[PDB]
Amino acid sequence: NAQAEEFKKYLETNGIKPKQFHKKELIFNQWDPQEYCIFLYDGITKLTSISENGTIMNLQYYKGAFVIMSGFIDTETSVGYYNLEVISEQATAYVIKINELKELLSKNLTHFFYVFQTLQKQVSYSLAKFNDFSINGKLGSICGQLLILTYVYGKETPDGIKITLDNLTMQELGYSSGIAHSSAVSRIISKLKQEKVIVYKNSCFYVQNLDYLKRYAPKLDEWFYLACPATWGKLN
């Protein structure tokens, strides 16, 4: 990813070091009065909110490279009581105090813009998932999630397009699709195998009817085309 590498260089040039995190660590947390800008270079994370009673809500998933800001760039205060939890075995991130960020993102036009456009991608991402859920309900959500997986992590094999993720759980798939109970997920996963869309072999998921995912996640597919055309084009 060209413009991701250009942003890495900018940060290192200015004395910002990568940091390594392991699974289950919080890169930033909902109880901290200091807010940060996170340049997630490598790894997979999820945004969570933890209620008083202890229930954990999974709000959004990110893979490197991406930018996540826990505070507003102007006020430096929280945008919401959120944690950024590492769910891959390792992740690499640059961690910048918000105040320190402004002293930098100014002197440069191009790098301001890279972060700007990432927020734009994210705004449109949530709108597309909402549109698909409004039309096709939970099937839309799950199809969109599998579509994402296929575009980002798919490899061509004779058994179909193999999702090359190792730790992927039926539960983590539901949370990533906004469905919190394994009953709904297994029901819909059942139909998908039953309609020959997905198959499970060798601990991995293989997609065999990619057109079907596109049919039920059409606005997320649109989003992929418009925001990630290079990727999208691999399988279109």
Ligand X SMILES: COc1c(Cc2cccc3ccccc23)cc(=O)n2c1SC[C@H]2C(=O)O
**Which stretch, 66-74, 96-104, 170-178, 227-235, contacts ligand X (CB under 6 A)?**
170-178
Does 219 interact with ligand X (rule: CB under 6 A)? no
Q: Give me the 64-103 binding string for Na ion, x by CB under 5 A, dash otherwise.
A: ------x---------------------------------
Does 29 interact with its own copies (rule: CB under 8 A)? no
For its own copies, the closer of residues 62 and 205 by Cβ is 62
In 3D space, the residue among 232, 178, 170, 231 whose CA is nearest the CA of residue 205 turns out to be: 170
Tokens read off for 227: 């925001």
Q: Which does 141 bind (CB under 5 to 8 A by kind): ligand X, its own copies, Na ion, none?
A: ligand X
Q: Give the chain's length.
A: 236
Question: Could you tell me which residues come within 8 angstroms of residue 90 by beta carbon, excluding any fewer than 6 positions away?
Answer: 20, 21, 22, 23, 42, 43
End-to-end Cα separation, the chain, in angstroms? 20
**Is there a contact between 224 and 154 (Cβ–Cβ < 8 Å)?**
no
- At CA 232, angle to CA 188 and CA 38, rounded to 5? 85
Out of 83, 131, 145, 177, which residue is the one contacting its own copies (CB under 8 A)? 131
Does 36 interact with ligand X (rule: CB under 6 A)? no
Cα–Cα distance, 234 to 236 (Å, whole number): 6
- Nearest approach in angstroms of CB 130 to ligand X is 4
Residues near its own copies (CB under 8 A): 3, 47, 49, 51-52, 57, 59-60, 69, 72-75, 77-82, 102, 105-106, 109, 112-117, 119-124, 126-128, 130-131, 134-135, 178, 180, 218-219, 222-223, 226-227
